[PDB]
Amino acid sequence: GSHMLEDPLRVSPMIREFVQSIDDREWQTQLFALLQKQTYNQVEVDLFELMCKVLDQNLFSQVDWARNTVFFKDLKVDDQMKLLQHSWSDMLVLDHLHHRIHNGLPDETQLNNGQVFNLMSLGLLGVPQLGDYFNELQNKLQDLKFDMGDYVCMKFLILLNPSVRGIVNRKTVSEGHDNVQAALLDYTLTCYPSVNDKFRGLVNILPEIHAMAVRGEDHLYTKHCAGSAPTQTLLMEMLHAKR
């Protein structure tokens, strides 16, 4: 139910459609697949680099998702690019927030290398120190009964942010953001009546999540400056954009 919609009988079509666009399975599959491929038959690997590899892949998938999004369709690339550039970091955390809670993703895994990958890092973007903060959010979210439905709406909310510098077709973005908020509100009201101010509780998180993303992007960029990771990646390009 957490990873599922609450009262499917009472859910809007829009939301159902949003949940359509998520294949959790593919995400986890893709994740371990890369991890296996990157590590089997290798004596040692740079764990930091690997995390980046995962993130790079995630980004591609992120882009793919947005692309097929109903709202993006009505958008020009320049505009889409700007939106994606703004919150890629933001989505990763939430996505991680989603898996950690909904799908029982663990903090670490044994690599078949005898090496251990900190999965948890993926959601901290390499800043270990944010774990308490990440956790605080995970707890807040759980108490709010964060569900699969909530998670998708929040993604759009994050993505479809009008107050983003340089976006030409502002109206469309505002409208979509505005719809989703409403849809989210409705869902909370109809399907989680018992949870008071759930809408606000969830909406309030986004700002918090963003703060985490910022630290994370900066660390990731700082690391790239040091020569720690490949420069040709989408991840770097994304990291680069705001500079």
Partner: peptide, 9 residues
């Protein structure tokens, strides 16, 4: 440009 390529297609 890579970003653009992906969404440009």
């Amino acid at each position: 440009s890579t970003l653009r390529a992906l969404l440009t297609n």
